[PDB]
Amino acid sequence: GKGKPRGLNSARKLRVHRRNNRWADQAYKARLLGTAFKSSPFGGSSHAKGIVLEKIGIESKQPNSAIRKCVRVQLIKNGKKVTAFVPNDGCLNFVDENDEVLLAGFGRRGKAKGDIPGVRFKVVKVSGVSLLALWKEKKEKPR
């Protein structure tokens, strides 16, 4: 009845069974295996500083037809090269090649967002100044 042990001396069989079946859960599996510590470009971090290498315009996924303007950034903490989005009408002009850009997530937590193919990060600050403050022109880029 119910297929799982119920006898009073069967607390062990339940302890092993649950712990085995928590591995099918990806939240548990990602945490214990430490895949963030190994294969995630930030290394489990929230933000990261990196160095811009080249600027790229990407064709959009269907059915949207546009260009998402991202950049090739190499990370200073571990030397990895991954693409980051530049989100603001006309904020491609604020970022130049070989600038240090503070990146963050898309809120999808390691997943591609929307119609943008192959990109998971966005630029938060350039040269130590927020790209939102530059888009609103609250401040000016240091140069």
Place this chain on the structure above:
Amino acid sequence: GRMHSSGKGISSSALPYSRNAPSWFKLSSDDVVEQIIKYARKGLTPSQIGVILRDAHGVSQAKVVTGNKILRILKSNGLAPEIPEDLYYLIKKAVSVRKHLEKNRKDKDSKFRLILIESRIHRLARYYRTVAVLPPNWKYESATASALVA
């Protein structure tokens, strides 16, 4: 039901609610006891002794007449088998099917039955060692089992 099968049959005996010897029964308590012993010396197993008692001599239950079980009478008269009857017959059948196998190697059904029979022997033998009927070192070996059922 059917420990080593899938059957669920219930055919069995139904002892009467009455635990007292019938009115028409004229034999005394002891006369049955030596009558039991007389058939005991002819090699008849307790199952056979009880069967021949009711069939021809009118003993419905030996416990309701003598007060004691058929095998319990045998033990107190030194006639209880060393190998208990059910264990004895399981081992003898195990030998006979085994002997059938050295002439018929391709009888996979016979091999499967033999595993079931010896599976039954060891479970019944484990019981007789928890209750000190057999020595605690008792072991069934197929090679020389025919010595015990000889």
Place this chain on the structure above:
Amino acid sequence: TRTSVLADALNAINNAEKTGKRQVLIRPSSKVIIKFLTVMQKHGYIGEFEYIDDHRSGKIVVQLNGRLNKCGVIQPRFNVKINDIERWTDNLLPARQFGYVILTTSAGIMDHEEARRKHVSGKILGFVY
């Protein structure tokens, strides 16, 4: 195999009570069953029940009245401390004003209200409402 006669008893009681039958046969009987019914009988949930002797485990014929909602066992018989009862009552019973938790104790088989009066605790044994 037959692992608990108490479970087989209340189930056949429930499988009769929903069916609207006014009597049900319980097999086999036992002291735990007989004392269980008495706690149910002194609360009117069942009627005059009879014990049949067959020189064996026994049988019980119960009379049903229709005031029984659901009677079931709690298996395994969890150990219940005096501070463990309020959790068992909340989860098993529909309301705070009726329904009972049958506990087997060193003082005997009793419901949680008679258990709290004499402030003794044992293993939980079932429920009735």
Place this chain on the structure above:
RNA sequence: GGGUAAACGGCGGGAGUAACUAUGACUCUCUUAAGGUAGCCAAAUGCCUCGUCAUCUAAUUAGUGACGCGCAUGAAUGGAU
């Protein structure tokens, strides 16, 4: 007239063709008894040739690992291990 290849043995050419080029899954074409299959290769078998790439070294016509339209590899004239 039939059979037989663990009998002797044999086992093809030319064109165009894929939203760059390159190549050609593909198609057309002449022709055979069949058109070299599985495999393997600059191999003790490759002329061109010190083939091209990698590795070995400071430096390697040597060696090894790959590549393969292979002058002229290849299955008991046994193939590959």
Place this chain on the structure above:
RNA sequence: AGGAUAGUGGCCUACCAUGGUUUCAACGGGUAACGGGGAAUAAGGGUUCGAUUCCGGAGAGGGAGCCUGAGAAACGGCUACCACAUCCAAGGAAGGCAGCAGGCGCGCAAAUUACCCAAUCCCGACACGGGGAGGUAGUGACAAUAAAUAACGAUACAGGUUGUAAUUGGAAUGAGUACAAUGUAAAUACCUUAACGAGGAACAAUUGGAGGGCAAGUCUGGUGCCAGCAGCCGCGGUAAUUCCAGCUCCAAAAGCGUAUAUUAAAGUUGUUGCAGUUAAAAAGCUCGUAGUUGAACCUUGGGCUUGGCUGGCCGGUCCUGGACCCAGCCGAGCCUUUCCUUCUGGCCAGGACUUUUACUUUGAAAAAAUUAGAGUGUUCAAAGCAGGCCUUUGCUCGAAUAUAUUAGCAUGGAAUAAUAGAAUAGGACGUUAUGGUUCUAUUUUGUUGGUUUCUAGGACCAUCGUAAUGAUUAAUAGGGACGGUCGGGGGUAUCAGUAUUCAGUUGUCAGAGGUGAAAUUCUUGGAUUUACUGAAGACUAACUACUGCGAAAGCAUUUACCAAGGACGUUUUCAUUAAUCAAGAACGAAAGUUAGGGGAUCGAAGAUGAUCAGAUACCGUCGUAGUCUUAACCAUAAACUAUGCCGACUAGGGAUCGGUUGUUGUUCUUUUAUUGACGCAAUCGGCACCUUACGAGAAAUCAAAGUCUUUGGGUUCUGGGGGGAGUAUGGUCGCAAGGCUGAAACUUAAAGGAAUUGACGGAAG
């Protein structure tokens, strides 16, 4: 046994045994691991975190070794090496911030080289010194508490006695600014406070949005699949409710978004509390070990007396208190055939005995802090444990109490689950039973010390006497025995049967075969066809079924043998011997592999004649492995009832198989019985089928897929969106083919289940 140690101990040595740990997870590996008190989140159960204000431990760059000392294997002690590293006059000398502040690097990520022993406490020869311990200040939107940017009139239109919307005022006040006093070791700050300090009271509130989720526009202009937005669905291709601007409005407010991780949401990790016929998921099937779980049964009832608190009646009322009365709910104390240890001093204290538990009450414990929580007007609050008193040469509530929870201690109880006893009696009592065997000794006869017999206590041994002398039922759990059966259950030999092919004979004579149509092919060297004779291998037609047997895979000619088996019958026998089961075993369709034998027919591969644009496909003709068998492997199938196994109950009905139990206008044996068949009533077990839905389900459907939010019979296995992928790798089994175990990166918003409508069909009517 020794040495060494402060001391026990393989801590070390010598000698001698071969032990110790482990599926109840040892040992090994990882740890983005110091542990705990605690933190976050939480209806509950839980999940994640804990470097870090307390406790315990370890370390001072990595090791190692020692001096002093009660106390160190110390690093703000030394020595040596390794790695760095400072000066050097080049001979040498000196290092250790994981103390305080501070400097570089690393990063997404983190403060002044300030003051002082005044408060807390420590150290010293000590009322006196020292303390980067500690305290105070500087930076600090880590968090938390309280809490400003206004208020009320008069006009004025609108308006239903007043809510305002504009232009008209007089007040109040702190934000700030400062005498001064307080505050302090000295200051800053807070609080008090003279004077200054508000009409746009510019002393100006921000953060996000306004399609949905989700609160707030279909307003205007710009762009025109572009820019871009959009967590997701999508918005943008010239009227964009969604981008880019303005206006308006919304949510929170000195606070508001973003990213990451985690908790709730998540009953998407499910003990409470998931799912497994079809959506992912019941091992091919049996055996079986550990483990989990395991029928019932042993003092109940009766009777009497008594203590306690609830409701009243009493009322006895300043809500409150008494016997009697009623019950109720507990505690007892006796008698009932009576457990409840047993003696001495005499309910406590001194002795002698005890089946083990598990469980549960209570007690003691579980540090402080943290949490809950008592009291207490820190102006409230966060707090803090202060405080309050007619103003005190002092009086005075306090500074609780809970929760902790596993292990260990004590304690009351005896249901539930175990555990033990009396079967070849080695059993229990004789308290003072008889003796006998031994052992211990206080006390003697006191002038002191030797003699062993009474004696007392064991501890046993033999005899006799006691007792109701001593064994629970046989579970519609099991196992076995026996009696007639029943099976297409298995193995070995043997007996048919036609058919197929091939051959030999006999007969004609132009075709035959094959297809939708043909051609390949065989044919006047007689094909096809005919009859008979003969040989090979396979396979057992029809009977043949909503029929049987088997763990499953499977099993269909006869007979003989061999050993098994289920069900039924049983007033036979043993008494729990059982259910499910990690690990481990047996069997396991077809195909495939190895070696012999057989190879009729079919027939992968191959070759072939058609069809076609092409088909080396479907169609046709041959054909090699194979198909069969004997020895061994393989271990997989849509191995399916896509439904684990065991157990109980629930609703009607009729057929059928094996058994067994009572019975016919029936035919037959044989002319009848004790024949058989048939027919009618029953029950056991099956394989199933029909209706209904009490109920279940997303539905199809389901007699189980019910007895599941009214969530608990036992137990095993399995699943956690779709791919990648049953792939890679490692291990392991196999001759090989392969089996078993088995990811990740990456990628994606769907994939899928049941059913409805339509559309479509080279489907039926």
Place this chain on the structure above:
RNA sequence: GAAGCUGGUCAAACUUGGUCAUUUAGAGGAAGUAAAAGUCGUAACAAGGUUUCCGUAGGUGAACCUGCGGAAGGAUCAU
């Protein structure tokens, strides 16, 4: 009673070797995913025009075909 000396003991450090673990290069090979639907065909979904699917073994440009044994999730609950 200093340096020194003998033998021991604890043993830093280096060399060699073995091992385990974690990263990282590589000619070439062989996959997977994405893109847009470039080339060839039409395997599946209707009886999908040869019913489909499972296991296994051969073959083939590719989808796939064929054999042998299964299943109906069949196009049959029915003679």
